[PDB]
């Protein structure tokens, strides 16, 4: 209830660049706090690249804030070295145009991870068009930048990892270990891949396009009945075992006969711990996932979003209103049925489309959670809800509602489609929140009042 | 206190005289009380009896929407003669039958198809001389000429894509909403959806970078769906809304493998039927006949949005004394030809909506006949 909603800071990017598709906090020590914004369709200076995507650094403070792009990669598409000698002419071995670089941006310490889910690449053997996906890992405040493309491997086709689209979702563990989700591996069974920054930097060898990172963790291929499950559509990290290694929470929106399910994979070795199942067909249970302790017990609790769930009004008319499920963890484990469920009110609002822990926004002793409905509100510009934590679990009524201050346009604003909270930009004891509105190429920073 | 009045109560068209009594679709009457007015006292319920009677010879329009992945080539070889066999069959059911055809495979974008030039030119193997992928194509608008359907369906080319699930929901939405371009009449509208695979739905476009939700407008240019790259797949809720709004009755003819998926889809979609299709569509005519009997033998009632303080309830008095209440009370089954059933509709108001002469409508799903209800508040 204490977010400064009467005068938030608005960041603007190039028109049509989807500026604000993903947002993240950045502070590489020395209080140099900054905001990272992804623009998957932005034009860049890379030779021969059309709409390669970009990531913007927007330092906080100094009254107005100017956003400048970061050069993760200044080079164009590589050429097939065989083509240089071949009389047929040079060929690109790689396709960076429309790669959606910056579709997901994450940071931890002075390291930044930005990924390009739509990045494609033709093998060095046969001319395929595999959308493997790629990520760039900035280290020690840009002093070193490494490419990490785990799904660019010897399994080069949709039957293998060719269509993996690694980096479709990603996250950092509290120790800095990288976690990626590829929805496409093995005929869209999906996959989760993880490696440490030390391992990546040790195995780095840029001239080998296919180069396996030693010690990498990944899930195994399964039988054909599991195809089209989209494992890794969304990922999150939390502690759900009796250890100190964060475990991977992954969404599988199309797993069980188009009923979604969310699986928690053991952090130490990537193996299944728990399963949770959706309630309605094609509700996209698992579109978004989050992990945070909402009832103050010190044990992380799980949140899952199903933005396409369909409900019926008392009158009897069916309507599309998303739903969010909360599973409280307890010392004996975590039960397979949700303790609480939150439902949207705006038709076609897609209530459970995004999630983010807010930390203890009001510093009352219980962490809070923000849920975004990109097409809610009277004008369908999108809405973000704030739900307070409590001793009995997450509250059922929002304590605050955030909406765009600007007027509606011909196109949707997608306000609330991307969220990030739990960090403080001012130095106050109160965490802040950043909301993406890529439909209008804007990102909004909300600050928690004392 | 509350009061009730009836303004239009034309009787059902039984045409018991015989076959000489031919009628236009608008002349046939199946719902008896066509108009009412109710005065409501705060907290006082008012009820009336609603009578339905199934007609005998209502016309039928059938649109055949078919998947054209390579696995359906043998299916197409059999669907070739449907334009004659199905009309011969339906002539036992209705005296006026029209048919139409359409096809679909998949969205033509990065993840769902191979985007190399060679594969865009031919998605299958060289021996399997497939044509380029396409989203949706309206081959033949609704017509009563069977030979035209036969020829046009015979001239179609098979295609293919990469991922097993197919993008047929785009085609379903376009067929539902494109109206005049397809020639729907105000008669029994049947949509036969035929395939041998799963289906994409909203949220799958994010993989290909399609984040804009389906708008539900018609986007056909030259009988081709042009915005497949621009709009995401429809959601099941959106399809339910549009199909129920446009009086489309759906028949899912799918192979044995995907019966468990399409049965749940049928449960979700009102006024739809599902049947088991052969490996090469040899029993499709019997599927259609059985599904038509199943659909036409049931009645489901719908009502529009009500004011904030108003509520409604249903009670159905079907054949053989079997009755219902709640969500089950707005439905009857086994309505044979010439059969008659009744419903009890109860309205209540708990507030005073500013003394306005409110109104709303009730109708049976799949028909354009409505019952108009006028609400007035004693305040």
């Amino acid at each position, epitope marked *: 209830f204490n977010l400064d909603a009467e005068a938030p800071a608005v960041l603007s990017g190039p028109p049509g660049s989807f500026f604000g598709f993903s947002v993240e906090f950045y502070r590489p020590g020395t209080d140099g706090v900054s905001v990272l914004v992804g623009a998957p369709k932005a034009n860049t200076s890379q030779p021969g690249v059309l709409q390669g995507g970009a990531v913007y650094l927007c330092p906080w403070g100094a009254s107005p804030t100017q956003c400048t792009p970061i050069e993760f990669d200044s080079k164009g598409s590589r050429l097939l070295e065989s083509s240089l000698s071949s009389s047929e002419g040079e060929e690109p071995v790689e396709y960076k145009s429309l790669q959606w670089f910056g579709a997901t941006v994450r940071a931890h310490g002075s390291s930044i991870l930005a990924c390009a889910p739509l990045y494609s690449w033709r093998t060095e*053997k*046969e001319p395929l068009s595999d959308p493997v996906g790629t990520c760039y890992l900035s280290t020690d405040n840009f002093t070193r930048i490494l490419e990490y493309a785990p799904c660019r491997s010897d399994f080069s086709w949709a039957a293998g990892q060719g269509y993996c689209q690694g980096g479709f979702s990603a996250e950092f563990t509290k120790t800095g270990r990288v976690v990626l989700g590829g929805p496409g591996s093995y005929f869209w069974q999906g996959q989760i891949l993880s490696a440490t920054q030390e391992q990546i930097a040790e195995s780095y060898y840029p001239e080998y396009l296919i180069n396996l990172v030693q010690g990498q963790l990944q899930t195994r291929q399964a039988s054909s009945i599991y195809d089209d499950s989209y494992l890794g559509y969304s990922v999150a990290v939390g502690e759900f075992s009796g250890d100190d290694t964060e475990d991977f929470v992954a969404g599988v929106p199309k797993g069980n006969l188009t009923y979604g399910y969310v699986t928690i994979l053991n952090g130490s070795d990537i193996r299944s711990l728990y399963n949770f199942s959706g309630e309605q067909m094609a509700s996209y249970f698992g579109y978004a996932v989050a992990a945070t302790d909402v009832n103050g017990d010190g044990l992380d609790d799980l949140l899952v979003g199903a933005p396409l769930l369909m409900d019926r009004t008392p009158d009897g008319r069916p309507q599309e209103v998303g739903r969010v499920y909360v599973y409280l963890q307890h010392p004996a484990g975590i039960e397979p049925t949700p303790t609480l469920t939150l439902t949207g009110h705006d038709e076609f609002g897609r209530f459970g489309s995004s999630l983010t822990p807010l930390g203890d926004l009001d510093q009352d002793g219980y962490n809070d959670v923000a849920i975004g409905a990109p097409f809610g509100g009277e004008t369908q510009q999108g809405v973000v809800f704030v739900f307070p934590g409590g001793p009995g679990g997450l509250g059922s009524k929002p304590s605050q509602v955030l909406q765009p201050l600007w007027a509606a346009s011909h196109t949707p604003d997608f306000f609330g489609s991307a969220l990030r909270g739990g960090r403080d930009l001012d130095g106050n004891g109160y965490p802040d929140l950043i909301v993406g509105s890529f439909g209008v190429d804007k990102a909004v920073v909300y600050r928690g009042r004392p | 206190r509350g009061s009730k009045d009836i303004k239009k109560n034309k009787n059902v068209t039984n045409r018991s005289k015989g076959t000489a009594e031919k009628l236009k679709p608008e002349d046939i009457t199946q719902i008896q009380p066509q108009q009412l007015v109710l005065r409501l006292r705060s907290g006082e319920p008012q009820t009336f009896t609603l009578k339905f009677k199934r007609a005998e010879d209502y016309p039928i329009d059938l649109y055949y929407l078919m998947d054209l992945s390579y696995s359906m080539k043998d299916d197409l070889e059999n669907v070739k003669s449907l334009g004659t066999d199905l009309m011969n069959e339906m002539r036992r059911i209705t005296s006026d039958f029209r048919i139409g055809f359409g096809s679909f495979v998949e969205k033509t974008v990065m993840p769902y198809i191979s985007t190399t030039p060679a594969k865009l030119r031919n998605p299958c193997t060289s021996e399997q001389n497939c044509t380029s992928p396409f989203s949706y194509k309206n081959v033949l608008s609704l017509t009563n000429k069977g030979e035209v359907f036969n020829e046009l369906v015979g001239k179609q080319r098979i295609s293919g894509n990469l991922d097993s699930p197919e993008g047929g929901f785009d085609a379903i939405m376009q067929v539902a909403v494109c109206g005049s371009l397809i020639g729907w009449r105000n008669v029994t509208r049947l949509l036969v959806f035929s395939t041998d695979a799963g289906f994409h739905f909203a949220g799958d476009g994010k993989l290909g970078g399609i984040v804009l939700p389906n708008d539900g407008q018609c986007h056909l240019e030259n009988n081709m769906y042009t915005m497949s790259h621009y709009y995401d797949y429809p959601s099941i809720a959106h399809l339910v809304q549009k199909l129920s709004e446009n009086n489309i009755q759906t028949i899912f003819a799918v192979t044995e493998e995907f019966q468990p998926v399409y049965k749940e889809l049928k449960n979700l979609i009102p006024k739809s039927a599902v049947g088991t299709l052969s490996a090469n569509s040899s029993n499709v005519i019997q599927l259609i006949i059985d599904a038509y009997n199943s659909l036409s033998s049931e009645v489901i009632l719908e009502n529009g949005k009500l004011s904030e303080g108003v509520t409604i309830s249903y009670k159905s008095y079907c054949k053989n004394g079997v009755n219902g209440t709640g969500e089950n009370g707005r439905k009857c089954s086994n309505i044979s030809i010439g059969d008659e059933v009744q419903f009890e509709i109860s309205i209540t108001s708990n507030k005073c909506p500013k003394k306005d002469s409110d109104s709303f409508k009730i109708r049976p799903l799949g028909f354009t006949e409505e019952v108009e209800v006028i609400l007035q508040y004693i305040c």
Partner: antibody
Amino acid sequence: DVQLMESGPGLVQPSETLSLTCTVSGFSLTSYNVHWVRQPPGKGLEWMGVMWSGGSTDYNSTLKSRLSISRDTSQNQVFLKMNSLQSEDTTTYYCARDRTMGMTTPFDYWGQGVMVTVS
Amino acid sequence: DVQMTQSPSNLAASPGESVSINCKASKRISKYLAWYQQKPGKANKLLIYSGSTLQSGTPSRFSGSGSGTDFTLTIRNLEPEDFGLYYCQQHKEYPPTFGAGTKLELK
């Protein structure tokens, strides 16, 4: 039990077209690529061309104007047609198998080879 | 286009001994090298791929080594059937290229 078997005329005139056949067993041509390799009388192996699993073909740039590769999935047969030349006498031809879509591998199976004389 | 050069054109050894065959590439090819055996009356047989991974039927006395541009094949205890011809193929990039071959004969 994968097996690649090779056949062709043992002796051809310098002007004729040399036609060779590789008959396969234990796998379907639509799942694997079938390559053609030759070993001149006293040299190492040389790659000639490939019949991709999808039905298209690629050839060695030096021989592309002379080569022509085809297949018959019904008969499990892959054909090679070439313009003959004396200077290529007593050269041996091989057909091999490998996968490029999915789990890529080197040439995992070979034929026994056929020796062709030109006079 | 990778040129592969195989060092010993001919080798002489006696059964029970040990030998090594070296194959070198014109450019770094990571670990993607395969070794083959050719007996006079039979087809080529894959022994090792990816530098050091044995094919299922390969006897354990065969071992591969090396990475980058230099690779070597070692036969630990020569049985009389190990004598023949040996080839190295790089499987990193197309078009495929092969070494000239090495012939192993009795001492």
